[PDB]
Amino acid sequence: GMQNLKADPEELFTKLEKIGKGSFGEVFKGIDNRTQKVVAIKIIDLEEAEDEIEDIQQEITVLSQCDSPYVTKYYGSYLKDTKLWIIMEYLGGGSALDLLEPGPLDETQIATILREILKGLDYLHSEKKIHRDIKAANVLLSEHGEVKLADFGVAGQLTDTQIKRNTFVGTPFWMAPEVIKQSAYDSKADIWSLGITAIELARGEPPHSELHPMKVLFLIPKNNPPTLEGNYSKPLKEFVEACLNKEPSFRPTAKELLKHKFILRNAKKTSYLTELIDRYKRWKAEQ
Ligand SMILES: Nc1ncnc2c1c(-c1cnc3[nH]ccc3c1)nn2C1CCCC1
Secondary structure, three states: OOOOOEEOHHHOEEEEEEEEEOOOOEEEEEEEOOOOOEEEEEEEEOOOOOOOHHHHHHHHHHHHHOOOOOEOOEEEEEEEOOEEEEEEEOOOOEEHHHHHOOOOOOHHHHHHHHHHHHHHHHHHHHOOEEOOOOOHHHEEEOOOOOEEEOOOOOOEEOOOOOOOEOOOOOOHHHOOHHHHOOOOEOOHHHHHHHHHHHHHHHHOOOOOOOOOHHHHHHHHHHOOOOOOOOOOOHHHHHHHHHHOOOOHHHOOOHHHHOOOHHHHHHOOOHHHHHHHHHHHHHHHHHO
């Protein structure tokens, strides 16, 4: 259940303008009235909510159970009449997908973003959690370039009695073949999705992005795994290859990937990502 659900959010927080649509409700900027820090508030009407309720519950449960610099920080969930307010860390730098809009990333930027995603995955997987929707749109940055995982509605939790999941969830272009087949799978599914995300960060789009998502549901289990094509460093191509093995047990762990030559050679301080954030702000303004 939601044992630490709170009430009266406006005693503590001020709701400001809408930011965008979240996975299951609108996201607003807000203010923590005790610190004057900006927060994000995801609001969903439980009146209108129906099918999404299980995933709303899962998002809250996962947020509440994580305490990592690499996972969106959680303030709490508040009941306000028929609405639920989920109050979180404000991440104002844009998603990694947003930051791709003005043009290509360089390999330092790719390696830095991937390193931080990997730290997030290493944390989640150590907590027996599987994100299951890893993609650039669910990687959010702060204004100062910190990188955090977001969007936990379809996260899975392994336990002592259920050591694998089998639910068909995720976003088709990024889904591991064993998830599509609804085989028993685990955190190695996230490692496949990470490989697709690496291609996305390097090329701007995942493999098969031209095709109808339903078609990729047969293409992915049948086809050879994607490779990174183009003039990229050998370590980046090999990083992608390591992730995108059809056999999950042959994929490295997140911890192992943090030692990969591509990451060690190319990842730098996250603060340098502010360059990318400024590029996006300029681009959105010139638009
Ligand atoms: N915390 C945030 N800060 C700033 N902007 C945010 C967010 C979120 C957001 C929304 N839901 C979430 N669930 C778990 C992490 C998480 C993050 N989503 N967004 C959205 C980015 C596109 C629409 C608004």
